[PDB]
Amino acid sequence: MVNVLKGVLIECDPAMKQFLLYLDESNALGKKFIIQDIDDTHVFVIAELVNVLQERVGELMD
Amino acid sequence: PGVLDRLYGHPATCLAVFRELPSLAKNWVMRMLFLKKEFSKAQEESTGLLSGLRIWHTQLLNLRIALLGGGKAWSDDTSQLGPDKHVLHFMVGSPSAAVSQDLAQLLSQAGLMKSTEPGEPPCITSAGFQFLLLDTPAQLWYFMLQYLQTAQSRGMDLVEILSFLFQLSFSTLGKDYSVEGMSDSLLNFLQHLREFGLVFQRTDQIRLWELERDRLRFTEGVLYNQFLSQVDFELLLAHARELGVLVFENSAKRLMVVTPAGHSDVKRFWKRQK
Amino acid sequence: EDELNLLVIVVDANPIWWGKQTLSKCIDAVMVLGNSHLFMNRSNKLAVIASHIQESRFLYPKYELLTSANEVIVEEIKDLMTKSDIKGQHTETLLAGSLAKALCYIHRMNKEVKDNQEMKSRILVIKAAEDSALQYMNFMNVIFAAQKQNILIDACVLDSDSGLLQQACDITGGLYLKVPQMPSLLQYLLWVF
């Protein structure tokens, strides 16, 4: 089962904020690159480099 | 009179018994201090002997004058003993003892100037690795050594003392780290150095804990694992992450799991053997 | 330092010191204490008296004098050691006599000082011995004189039971301490009073 590995960052956000990151993912310019996938409602596989952006954008956004 | 040797003897016995491993000696040594002491002491085991050595000079503070001179006489013996002996605990003991002899003003500046012990304090002072505890006794020794010289007219030691200058790099480090304790020790060295030789030398805050919390926000740096060949290899590789305590998440119906970066390598090794 | 201060130390010589088995050490400690006391202020003076079994005697009479004080004390005590009044041959000591001597000295020093300003004095007793009924009138006479004089009599009982001394401190408004651990003598002298 050690078939495949992928370095990624695991984000453990709440059931409220997660959907904003996804929203952030779409309807965005130079984006949609951001989320690898939604593993759980709470957790997402995302970014790497994008994490700095996702966090900052969330901050700036309401 | 006869009672005197007996009573104090019992505490000599107690210190002797739990002499080796820890730091039992300090309290008992003090009691021992009051009641050729140095010559006789020398035979006894080093640790504890040094402890007694340390506190006795401190304890001195007419007949007292006689005592100091007597101590001065065998300052060499302790000094010979100090070197040669030279853990952090031991190291603390050797400088603490040296420091104590220094304040007494019994030690000969010459002799001290050319001795390994002075090199050793700045050596530990230089190295980043030494702990805060070693640092404070090392620092104190230096301060006391300089304190001892109330002249510098005739004090070769106030040359080697200059070895403080070497410390600045160490202070730069220490500063880089948030080691306030170390820095304070440095300042004491500087201030003391200047002192000896000065003549010769020319609500509202509620938003501030919230602004601190704005600098912390979570995610983890991570490996994901997928496309696992059969369930036994998820469960082995998963249980071997869970005992390593670096599972961030798991879902057995996905056959998918997550490890933070610090145990990527123990997983990469277990994936290769079994 | 403005006020001249005389501290008289009465040392109980009794052979009880044998039980103490050391007198030599007690002297060394007392000397250290005196040196510190004299060093604290220019105006401090010290007088030392020995209350022996047979009689009271003056060991010594400023800090500059300390070297003199040390020699005078060592020599004086050695003379005292004599066999008579040996061990508990005589349980008591002549404290009344010692106190009388102390008050006389304090008075004389005071008169000279009277020419000048006021003097403050206190008496310290290092007590090894036991009190006796015969002693009551004489001791109390001296004690009461001190109280009237407003001279505190402090007492450090290394051992034995001198009730009169305990009473003496109470009347005098002085301090009385029965020392547990006699080897801690130096600490008591410095700390206690």
Curated annotation (Swiss-Prot), chain A:
Coiled coil ranges: none
SMART domains: Tbf5 (SM01395)
Alphabetically ordered keywords of this record: Cytoplasm, Disease variant, DNA damage, DNA repair, Ichthyosis, Nucleus, Phosphoprotein, Transcription, Transcription regulation
InterPro entries: TFB5-like_sf (IPR035935), TFIIH_TTDA/Tfb5 (IPR009400)
Superkingdom of this protein's organism: Eukaryota
Gene Ontology cellular-component terms listed: cytoplasm; nucleolus; nucleoplasm; transcription factor TFIID complex; transcription factor TFIIH core complex; transcription factor TFIIH holo complex
Family assignment from sequence similarity: Belongs to the TFB5 family.
Functional summary from the UniProt entry: Component of the general transcription and DNA repair factor IIH (TFIIH) core complex, which is involved in general and transcription-coupled nucleotide excision repair (NER) of damaged DNA and, when complexed to CAK, in RNA transcription by RNA polymerase II. In NER, TFIIH acts by opening DNA around the lesion to allow the excision of the damaged oligonucleotide and its replacement by a new DNA fragment. In transcription, TFIIH has an essential role in transcription initiation.
Disease tied to this protein: Trichothiodystrophy 3, photosensitive: A form of trichothiodystrophy, an autosomal recessive disease characterized by sulfur-deficient brittle hair and multisystem variable abnormalities. The spectrum of clinical features varies from mild disease with only hair involvement to severe disease with cutaneous, neurologic and profound developmental defects. Ichthyosis, intellectual and developmental disabilities, decreased fertility, abnormal characteristics at birth, ocular abnormalities, short stature, and infections are common manifestations.
Designated name of the protein: General transcription factor IIH subunit 5
UniProtKB/Swiss-Prot annotation, chain B:
GO CC terms in record: core TFIIH complex portion of holo TFIIH complex; nuclear speck; nucleoplasm; nucleus; transcription factor TFIID complex; transcription factor TFIIH core complex; transcription factor TFIIH holo complex
GO molecular function: ATPase activator activity; double-stranded DNA binding; RNA polymerase II general transcription initiation factor activity
GO BP of this protein: DNA repair; nucleotide-excision repair; transcription by RNA polymerase II
Subcellular location(s) per record: Nucleus
Record's function text: Component of the general transcription and DNA repair factor IIH (TFIIH) core complex, which is involved in general and transcription-coupled nucleotide excision repair (NER) of damaged DNA and, when complexed to CAK, in RNA transcription by RNA polymerase II. In NER, TFIIH acts by opening DNA around the lesion to allow the excision of the damaged oligonucleotide and its replacement by a new DNA fragment. In transcription, TFIIH has an essential role in transcription initiation.
Protein name: General transcription factor IIH subunit 4
Pfam families: Tfb2, Tfb2_C
Assembly and binders: Component of the 7-subunit TFIIH core complex composed of XPB/ERCC3, XPD/ERCC2, GTF2H1, GTF2H2, GTF2H3, GTF2H4 and GTF2H5, which is active in NER. The core complex associates with the 3-subunit CDK-activating kinase (CAK) module composed of CCNH/cyclin H, CDK7 and MNAT1 to form the 10-subunit holoenzyme (holo-TFIIH) active in transcription.
Annotated keywords: DNA damage, DNA repair, Nucleus, Transcription, Transcription regulation
Domain notes: The C-terminus (residues 305-462) stimulates the ATPase activity of XPB/ERCC3.
Family statement drawn from the similarity comment of this UniProt entry: Belongs to the TFB2 family.
Swiss-Prot record, chain C:
GO cellular component, one term: nucleoplasm
Location (main, coarse): nucleus
Superkingdom per UniProt: Eukaryota
Location within or outside the cell: Nucleus
Keyword terms of this UniProt record: DNA damage, DNA repair, Metal-binding, Nucleus, Transcription, Transcription regulation, Zinc, Zinc-finger
GO molecular function, one term: RNA polymerase II general transcription initiation factor activity
Record-level GO BP terms: DNA repair; nucleotide-excision repair; regulation of DNA-templated transcription; transcription by RNA polymerase II
Record family assignment: Belongs to the TFB4 family.
Function: Component of the general transcription and DNA repair factor IIH (TFIIH) core complex, which is involved in general and transcription-coupled nucleotide excision repair (NER) of damaged DNA and, when complexed to CAK, in RNA transcription by RNA polymerase II. In NER, TFIIH acts by opening DNA around the lesion to allow the excision of the damaged oligonucleotide and its replacement by a new DNA fragment. In transcription, TFIIH has an essential role in transcription initiation.
Quaternary structure, from the entry: Part of a TFIID-containing RNA polymerase II pre-initiation complex that is composed of TBP and at least GTF2A1, GTF2A2, GTF2E1, GTF2E2, GTF2F1, GTF2H2, GTF2H3, GTF2H4, GTF2H5, GTF2B, TCEA1, ERCC2, ERCC3, TAF1, TAF2, TAF3, TAF4, TAF5, TAF6, TAF7, TAF8, TAF9, TAF10, TAF11, TAF12 and TAF13. Component of the 7-subunit TFIIH core complex composed of XPB/ERCC3, XPD/ERCC2, GTF2H1, GTF2H2, GTF2H3, GTF2H4 and GTF2H5, which is active in NER.
Record protein name field: General transcription factor IIH subunit 3
Organism per entry: Homo sapiens
Range covered out of full length: 5 to 231 of 308
